[PDB]
Amino acid sequence: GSHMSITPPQIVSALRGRGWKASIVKASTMSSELKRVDPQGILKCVDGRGSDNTQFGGPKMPGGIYAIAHNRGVTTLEGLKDITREVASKGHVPSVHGDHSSDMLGCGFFKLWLTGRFDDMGYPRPEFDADQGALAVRAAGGVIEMHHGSHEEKVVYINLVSGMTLEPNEHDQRFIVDGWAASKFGLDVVKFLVAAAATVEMLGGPKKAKIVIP
Ligand SMILES: [Cl-]
Ligand SMILES: [Zn+2]
Incomplete structure (x- = not known):
């Protein structure tokens, strides 16, 4: 797809x-x-919380596949279904998630996007709600994961090591962002990383990052 136009020292x-x-x-x-x-793993959110996921080893992006639609300015359910299928065809099981406290609005990233918190960064808001989005992903062959508990992330790992990922630890949480995956899907990597940073910020997460390189 696209390439890392930004270097690690610059990200820092x-x-x-x-x-x-x-x-x-x-x-x-x-x-x-x-x-x-693991190709059988779901491409899921950067969320550091525990969940009912049984499909481990997939890439981590804000809001699961929503990071892709968000980066691309894709705001329709049909377009989201296209992305769901695209991800499936590219080696990962597509997913989005909700939680127990707020149901489908349980993904902080999608809630930030839906409520216009990315307005000033110039992103088009989705034209569907969290329930519609979740069901469209499911109907297109994707997975709806459900998280539980409170956000207790202590650090953010921005992984740039292609083909690798880090997993959630609900008792010693961390946000995990697989930046290499943005390149795989032809995303504007700089925008993807800035959006991931803004997400942690707006969710009141820890503004501490470790950038992992080969
Ligand atoms: Cl989340
Ligand atoms: Zn989420």
Whole structure:
């Protein structure tokens, strides 16, 4: 698809400029945690909470496949179904998620998007609600995952190691953003990463990041 027009040191610079604490960490220091992506795993949200997921090992993007629609300015249910099928055809099981406290509005990213919190960054709002979106993804062969508990993330990992990912730990949470996946889907990587950063910020998450590189 597209390529990383931005380097790791710059990502760190951009984040710090947004008021973040950021540093670069080598993949070799996480040999124990970095997992090769499993094609049977759902491409899911960066959310650090536990859930009822049984399809582990998939890439992590804000709102699951919503990160792709959001980055591309795709705002219709038909377009979302197209993306769902596209993701399935590209090696991952597509998904979106809700939670127990707010049901389908349980994904903070989609709620931020639907409510216009990305208005100032110039993003077109979706033209469907969280219930409509979830059911469209399901009807197109995707998965609706359900999270539980409170957001207790302590750090954000921005993984740039292609084909690998990190998994949720509900008792020692972290946001995980597979930046390499944005390139795989031809997304504007810089916008994707800035949106992921804004998401953590607006969800009142920790503005501390570790950028993982080969
Ligand atoms: Cl979420
Ligand atoms: Zn979410």
